[PDB]
Design an enzyme around this catalytic site. Structure first.
Site, mmCIF file in Angstrom:
data_model
loop_
_atom_site.group_PDB
_atom_site.id
_atom_site.type_symbol
_atom_site.label_atom_id
_atom_site.label_comp_id
_atom_site.label_asym_id
_atom_site.label_seq_id
_atom_site.Cartn_x
_atom_site.Cartn_y
_atom_site.Cartn_z
ATOM 1 N N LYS B 50 31.998 12.134 19.721
ATOM 2 C CA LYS B 50 32.267 10.901 20.431
ATOM 3 C C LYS B 50 31.774 9.681 19.630
ATOM 4 O O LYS B 50 32.049 8.552 20.045
ATOM 5 C CB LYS B 50 31.579 10.929 21.804
ATOM 6 C CG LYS B 50 31.791 12.236 22.582
ATOM 7 C CD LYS B 50 31.335 12.144 24.042
ATOM 8 N N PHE B 91 23.895 17.051 10.190
ATOM 9 C CA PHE B 91 22.820 17.836 9.645
ATOM 10 C C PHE B 91 22.167 18.697 10.710
ATOM 11 O O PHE B 91 22.117 19.941 10.573
ATOM 12 C CB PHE B 91 21.820 16.867 8.947
ATOM 13 C CG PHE B 91 20.457 17.397 8.693
ATOM 14 C CD1 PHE B 91 20.243 18.646 8.111
ATOM 15 C CD2 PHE B 91 19.347 16.630 9.013
ATOM 16 C CE1 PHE B 91 18.943 19.126 7.894
ATOM 17 C CE2 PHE B 91 18.052 17.094 8.795
ATOM 18 C CZ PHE B 91 17.852 18.360 8.223
ATOM 19 N N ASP B 96 21.244 23.666 13.869
ATOM 20 C CA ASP B 96 20.918 24.095 15.202
ATOM 21 C C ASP B 96 21.891 25.169 15.686
ATOM 22 O O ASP B 96 21.499 26.090 16.375
ATOM 23 C CB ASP B 96 20.915 22.899 16.118
ATOM 24 C CG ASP B 96 20.651 23.258 17.551
ATOM 25 O OD1 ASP B 96 19.440 23.505 17.861
ATOM 26 O OD2 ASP B 96 21.584 23.228 18.371
ATOM 27 N N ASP B 100 20.647 28.614 17.149
ATOM 28 C CA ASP B 100 20.914 28.954 18.552
ATOM 29 C C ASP B 100 21.962 30.029 18.747
ATOM 30 O O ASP B 100 22.305 30.390 19.908
ATOM 31 C CB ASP B 100 21.295 27.705 19.320
ATOM 32 C CG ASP B 100 20.132 26.732 19.430
ATOM 33 O OD1 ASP B 100 19.004 27.195 19.207
ATOM 34 O OD2 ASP B 100 20.303 25.529 19.745
ATOM 35 N N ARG B 105 31.631 24.252 18.504
ATOM 36 C CA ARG B 105 31.059 22.879 18.440
ATOM 37 C C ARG B 105 32.196 21.894 18.228
ATOM 38 O O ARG B 105 33.067 22.110 17.330
ATOM 39 C CB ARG B 105 30.105 22.816 17.279
ATOM 40 C CG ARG B 105 29.622 21.432 16.855
ATOM 41 C CD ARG B 105 28.574 20.826 17.814
ATOM 42 N NE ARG B 105 27.275 21.535 17.765
ATOM 43 C CZ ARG B 105 26.253 21.198 18.550
ATOM 44 N NH1 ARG B 105 26.406 20.164 19.353
ATOM 45 N NH2 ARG B 105 25.116 21.840 18.525
ATOM 46 N N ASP B 167 10.744 23.644 20.871
ATOM 47 C CA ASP B 167 11.904 24.317 21.485
ATOM 48 C C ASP B 167 11.918 25.797 21.127
ATOM 49 O O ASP B 167 11.960 26.664 22.005
ATOM 50 C CB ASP B 167 13.196 23.569 21.058
ATOM 51 C CG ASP B 167 14.509 24.253 21.522
ATOM 52 O OD1 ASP B 167 14.878 25.340 21.009
ATOM 53 O OD2 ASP B 167 15.188 23.669 22.374
ATOM 54 N N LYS B 193 12.633 16.344 20.484
ATOM 55 C CA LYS B 193 13.816 16.956 19.902
ATOM 56 C C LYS B 193 15.055 16.082 20.005
ATOM 57 O O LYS B 193 15.912 16.171 19.115
ATOM 58 C CB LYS B 193 14.044 18.428 20.385
ATOM 59 C CG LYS B 193 14.830 18.607 21.651
ATOM 60 C CD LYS B 193 15.495 19.940 21.747
ATOM 61 C CE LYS B 193 16.112 20.116 23.119
ATOM 62 N NZ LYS B 193 16.593 21.497 23.351
ATOM 63 N N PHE B 232 19.444 12.192 28.869
ATOM 64 C CA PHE B 232 20.605 12.702 28.123
ATOM 65 C C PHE B 232 20.418 14.170 27.852
ATOM 66 O O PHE B 232 21.347 14.935 27.948
ATOM 67 C CB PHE B 232 20.753 11.904 26.839
ATOM 68 C CG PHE B 232 21.865 12.347 25.945
ATOM 69 C CD1 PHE B 232 23.096 11.752 26.019
ATOM 70 C CD2 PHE B 232 21.642 13.296 24.993
ATOM 71 C CE1 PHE B 232 24.133 12.148 25.212
ATOM 72 C CE2 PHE B 232 22.657 13.701 24.122
ATOM 73 C CZ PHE B 232 23.932 13.120 24.234
ATOM 74 N N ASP B 236 22.605 17.350 28.949
ATOM 75 C CA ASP B 236 23.013 18.359 28.013
ATOM 76 C C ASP B 236 22.724 19.776 28.478
ATOM 77 O O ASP B 236 23.553 20.691 28.337
ATOM 78 C CB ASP B 236 22.332 18.189 26.644
ATOM 79 C CG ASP B 236 22.824 19.217 25.630
ATOM 80 O OD1 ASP B 236 24.047 19.106 25.250
ATOM 81 O OD2 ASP B 236 21.983 20.078 25.223
ATOM 82 N N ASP B 237 21.548 19.970 29.003
ATOM 83 C CA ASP B 237 21.160 21.269 29.577
ATOM 84 C C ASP B 237 22.032 21.689 30.805
ATOM 85 O O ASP B 237 22.451 22.867 30.936
ATOM 86 C CB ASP B 237 19.708 21.237 30.024
ATOM 87 C CG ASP B 237 18.698 21.163 28.855
ATOM 88 O OD1 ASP B 237 19.058 21.164 27.688
ATOM 89 O OD2 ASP B 237 17.496 20.990 29.143
HETATM 90 C C1 LIG Z 1 15.997 20.909 10.395
HETATM 91 C C2 LIG Z 1 16.847 21.001 11.651
HETATM 92 C C3 LIG Z 1 16.819 22.400 12.091
HETATM 93 O O1 LIG Z 1 16.229 20.246 12.689
HETATM 94 C C4 LIG Z 1 16.868 20.074 13.884
HETATM 95 C C5 LIG Z 1 16.124 19.518 14.911
HETATM 96 C C6 LIG Z 1 16.704 19.253 16.162
HETATM 97 C C7 LIG Z 1 18.034 19.543 16.472
HETATM 98 C C8 LIG Z 1 18.578 19.254 17.757
HETATM 99 C C9 LIG Z 1 18.013 18.301 18.581
HETATM 100 N N1 LIG Z 1 18.522 18.030 19.823
HETATM 101 C C10 LIG Z 1 19.596 18.699 20.309
HETATM 102 C C11 LIG Z 1 20.212 19.681 19.538
HETATM 103 N N2 LIG Z 1 21.236 20.410 19.992
HETATM 104 C C12 LIG Z 1 21.457 20.671 21.433
HETATM 105 P P1 LIG Z 1 23.195 21.313 21.590
HETATM 106 O O2 LIG Z 1 23.461 21.629 23.016
HETATM 107 O O3 LIG Z 1 23.210 22.567 20.787
HETATM 108 O O4 LIG Z 1 24.074 20.310 20.959
HETATM 109 P P2 LIG Z 1 20.176 21.810 22.046
HETATM 110 O O5 LIG Z 1 20.116 23.061 21.140
HETATM 111 O O6 LIG Z 1 20.542 22.252 23.402
HETATM 112 O O7 LIG Z 1 18.811 21.193 21.828
HETATM 113 C C13 LIG Z 1 19.685 19.936 18.273
HETATM 114 C C14 LIG Z 1 18.795 20.139 15.435
HETATM 115 C C15 LIG Z 1 18.230 20.363 14.160
HETATM 116 MG MG LIG Z 2 21.871 24.110 20.255
HETATM 117 MG MG LIG Z 3 18.742 24.019 19.835
HETATM 118 MG MG LIG Z 4 22.166 22.019 24.602
#
Ligand SMILES: CC(C)Oc1ccc(-c2cncc(NC(P(=O)(O)O)P(=O)(O)O)c2)cc1
Ligand SMILES: [Mg+2]
Ligand SMILES: [Mg+2]
Ligand SMILES: [Mg+2]
Ligand SMILES: CC(C)Oc1ccc(-c2cncc(NC(P(=O)(O)O)P(=O)(O)O)c2)cc1
Ligand SMILES: [Mg+2]
Ligand SMILES: [Mg+2]
Ligand SMILES: [Mg+2]
Lengths: 346, 346
Positions: B50, B91, B96, B100, B105, B167, B193, B232, B236-237
């Site tokens: 977005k 990045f 992530d 995860d 995506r 996390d 995060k 936010f 997301d959760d």
């Molecule tokens: C070096 C790298 C691993 O560091 C990171 C640090 C943080 C994040 C990150 C921070 N906030 C949200 C996301 N993604 C969300 P998402 O729903 O996956 O878009 P979350 O897994 O539910 O937390 C990733 C991604 C990468």
């Molecule tokens: Mg994630």
């Molecule tokens: Mg994550």
């Molecule tokens: Mg999420």
């Protein structure tokens, strides 16, 4: 050996590094558990190597700064910047070991292979990188070279990652493509992936800390140090297969991982058509039997003796470059580093 | 909607970003193949969202800089800094998604799930990060805010990675530990995060570009923006499980991945002892049947309606914070962002 001399003070400064980084906690208890994890990542992955890249910063700095300006604060800054190079290396190796499917590093299981770590090590690796920039801010932000160091670490990381990209693109899994493994391609890979951060970066950091920022000064140094870095990577490739793992602290994966190593490039220049087929059928595969066959072909082509001749010719070449390009820096800055890396078996 | 208005110009500037980054080639042909790979990584992973974090930089900048100082160069710098935030996000998400075990995506397969990519995406992700600092140097290095932006992006990345560490540490695989999932822990996780980089960073970048560097000015802004960022992440959760994937462009993994999500925290506050057991036996596991059971428990506890009430209370709270802390910035800088994220279903 000027490195053995500086080494103890250097390694001793590691607790102080760890203490200052694990005191981001004081104002924020809520991050305590993350900080504990950072400490474990630091203690597992930044300690246990030879410290040669970090130590180069300290040696060069003492050699380039007038002894009268080497006060306690200046030295602390020097040891901190050396530790920043070690931290960069730790970042790189944690990630690279995942990428290369490696087993061991520095005499122990790779961090990502520990039960309970796994791909969480991607985050761990990137935290190590972050620590560089926190240390530079905490110790150097008021110095006239602060921005220069930041830019140098960022540029060196970009170049290094460009090299890593050429490394992975030249080595596709499940595909045999020997035609790509040329000398020209090899030299580009290693210049980018290893030579900038392992050789140019530490000396350049010390230069900047000594107030040596001139473009020409840096380009001359770079001519020496990128060539030393090519040799170091060629030696790394040789040691992947022919090194003793109790000395190197790691198990080799280049043949399994289909890598453009100096060894395969050398093999290809020398193989008969029959031997080319042998390489073709066996290279880049997981089977131990096929890996052994590649090694036996390398031994049949006297590639260890090819390496020993190359190490001798490269050492002369590098020394010729020191004669051409050291001035007006003391030749000892380069000589101590050459001594350190030539005849190295680890 | 001020975002819809700026959006086209923003997205159009993407080719120029790609062109300037893929012209590190001109002086060095040997890196050509790496640059081609960078382009593919940019086109796959930086496009298709977005653009709200990047666009916030541009909107805020036009709102904070006197129109007379918004020349063509200033605007280009603004769109480039917005793109730097998008690159940071790219990045993060690439890494992530590996961490995860995600599937999709932005409406397509995650980059690391493509045949032929796999864990090479670790390097890809880190190249995206590198590009931030190259763009800041190429477009902003002569500006009086250059260092401020560098430090801000580096600090925001550190904080973000500290959050990511909390996390992963709160979510161990193969272990059931519900006792850790508290409100207090949740708030710390998400602040670090998500809230720093998604909300504080872009507005702060625009502030610095407008010459607003005061510590107090930044702390007031931060009070608003970290709270908006907590909301936010809570959204997301919620959307991880209850969102429509054709809107969100991604499949949820929080329950499988044993995550400290707002949903599980809310569930725990409300569960009977019987229901606690249900959660305990089913949470953090790969089996579809067990995931469905957790969702059915959430629905039995009216957790969607709990979310809707929370969104209403949080929106009021945030608006109260804008009333307290916006001055002397125009309230519109915060209001347009609040509008953008509240009632958001993607
Ligand atoms: C070096 C790298 C691993 O560091 C990171 C640090 C943080 C994040 C990150 C921070 N906030 C949200 C996301 N993604 C969300 P998402 O729903 O996956 O878009 P979350 O897994 O539910 O937390 C990733 C991604 C990468
Ligand atoms: Mg994630
Ligand atoms: Mg994550
Ligand atoms: Mg999420
Ligand atoms: C973002 C991160 C993945 O970027 C990296 C870029 C480069 C490297 C790297 C550069 N030179 C040498 C190594 N490791 C050696 P090694 O023998 O594994 O120590 P190589 O795999 O044989 O090249 C890693 C590691 C990480
Ligand atoms: Mg390796
Ligand atoms: Mg490698
Ligand atoms: Mg190697």
């Amino acid at each position: 050996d000027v490195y053995a001399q500086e080494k103890q003070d250097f390694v001793q400064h590691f607790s102080q590094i760890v203490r200052v980084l694990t005191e981001d906690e004081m104002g924020h208890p809520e991050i305590g558990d993350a900080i504990a994890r950072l400490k474990e990542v630091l203690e597992y992955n930044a300690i246990g190597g030879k410290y040669n890249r970090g130590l180069t910063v300290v040696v060069a700095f003492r050699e380039l700064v007038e002894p009268r300006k080497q006060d306690a604060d200046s030295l602390q800054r020097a040891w901190t910047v050396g530790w920043c190079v070690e931290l960069l290396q730790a970042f790189f190796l944690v990630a690279d070991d995942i990428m290369d499917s490696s087993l061991t590093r520095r005499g122990q299981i790779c961090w990502y292979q520990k039960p309970g770590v796994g791909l969480d090590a991607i985050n761990d690796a990137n935290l190590l990188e972050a620590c560089i920039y926190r240390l530079l801010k905490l110790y150097c932000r008021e110095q006239p070279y602060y921005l220069n160091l930041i830019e140098l670490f960022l540029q060196s990381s970009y170049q290094t990652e460009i090299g890593q990209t050429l490394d992975l693109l030249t080595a596709p899994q499940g595909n045999v493509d020997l035609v790509r493994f040329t000398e020209k391609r090899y030299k580009s890979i290693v210049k980018y992936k290893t030579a900038f951060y392992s050789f140019y970066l530490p000396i350049a950091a010390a230069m900047y800390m000594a107030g040596i920022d001139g473009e020409k000064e840096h380009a001359n140094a770079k001519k020496i140090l990128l060539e030393m870095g090519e040799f170091f990577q060629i030696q790394d490739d040789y040691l992947d297969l022919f090194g003793d793992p109790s000395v190197t602290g790691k198990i080799g994966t280049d043949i399994q991982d289909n890598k453009c190593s100096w060894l395969v490039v050398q093999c290809l220049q020398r193989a008969t058509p029959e031997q080319y087929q042998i390489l073709k059928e066996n290279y880049g595969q997981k089977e131990a039997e096929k890996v052994a066959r590649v090694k036996a072909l390398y031994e049949e082509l006297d590639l260890p003796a090819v390496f020993l001749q190359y190490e001798e010719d490269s050492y002369s070449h590098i020394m010729a470059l020191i004669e051409q390009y050291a001035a007006p820096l003391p030749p000892a800055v380069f000589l101590g580093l050459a001594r350190k890396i030539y005849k190295r078996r680890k």
